[PDB]
């Protein structure tokens, strides 16, 4: 099969860079321009390389809070996986480094903004529009899962739209090389698979569940399981109960029932034929999978930008001084970064 | 403008 040979070469490329793991830039070299997004352990900023003039997105992670919160291996996973993967819908890592206080991952800047903000503004995507983004996610998961990688935080906020309207997956914070089961409670509440909530030990099937939530939210405008308190969200997820907007196509409802299948014996993507059950589903019958990979399909929506470093597609955030200590912090814990 | 409340990841 063409696909199988492709994946096998992708694995070879990956394992080589997987053993390439240092300090390929320094903070000194970048003007920090604007915060693009804030998170629990730091922020992502638009920066500009002062000498070349290129713009990038720099994720800053505070080493101390990372250590305090038992996130060292996650943080090492994030950077190691991001540098070794290579796929048209995965954001590029251009530099990474560390200092006395922080870890830094300098990515290509995807100026289109979060899928989340366009989705909330438009309200909901049409089924062809949703299908265009989903197809790219299906191929990306087939690729990552082929290298024994689980992604574990699919949601609109982690999907960026590029200048051609295609998807760039960012935020590899929970990505992990996994053959077999893993056990860490992580992800985003509205998107967690039931086996994660129930602490049963899980595998790549949790990514196919998240795809079903993603497709549901893209098409409906809201996710299938949400409530005021996350305990209520988890009760819904675990219940095996999903109501569909009447405006959903019957094909869309059938695909969602098979991805939002709480029984792993039945969840699409986890059966004998693997990802092919999703690719072959009637909801995708009009999808040219090779054309999507080659990025030859005309996107349904292209964000507008006014030159490089434009940030109009991002919310505004409270800025703050980047705290870098006079003393090295947590040196031993991050030697491999 | 429409509300747009981003959802943060969660750990243990
Ligand atoms: N390469 C990039 N280009 C442009 N914007 C980006 C890029 N990477 C991240 N962002 C933005 O910055 C935000 C935060 O990045 P993210 O990697 O999700 O950090 P995080 O702390 O792990 N957030 P989360 O775990 O979901 O609570 C994203 O939601 C995007 O809005
Ligand atoms: Mg994120
Ligand atoms: Mg994250």
Residue numbers in the entry:
A (entry chain A): 13 to 33, 35 to 350
B (entry chain B): 8 to 19
Show sentences the authors wrote.
PLN, an important regulator of SERCA, is a 6.2 kDa single-pass integral membrane protein that can reversibly inhibit SERCA activity by physically interacting with the calcium pump and thus regulate the contraction of cardiac muscle. PKA mediates phosphorylation of PLN at Ser16, which relieves its inhibition of SERCA, increasing muscle contractility and relaxation rate. Our structural models for the three complexes all show a monomeric form of PKAc that forms a 1:1 complex with PLN, which is consistent with the solution behavior of PKAc.
In both cases, PKAc crystallized in a closed conformation with PLN docked to the large lobe and AMP-PNP bound with the small lobe. The N-terminal region (NTR) of WT PLN (Thr8 to Ile12) makes extensive interactions with helix 4 of the large lobe of PKAc. The binding is mainly mediated by an electrostatic interaction between the positively charged side chain of PLN Arg9 and the negative dipole moment of α-helix 4 and by a hydrophobic interaction between Ala11 of PLN and Phe129 of PKAc. The hydroxyl group of the phosphorylation site, Ser16, is ~3.4 Å away from the γ-phosphate group of AMP-PNP, similar to other reported PKA structures. Arg14, from the classic R-R-X-S/T motif, forms extensive interactions with PKAc, involving a salt bridge network with Glu170 and Glu230 and van der Waals contacts with Phe129, Thr201, Pro169, and Glu203 of PKAc, similar to what was seen in previous studies with other peptides known to bind PKAc. The asymmetric unit (ASU) of our structure contains one PKAc bound to one PLN.
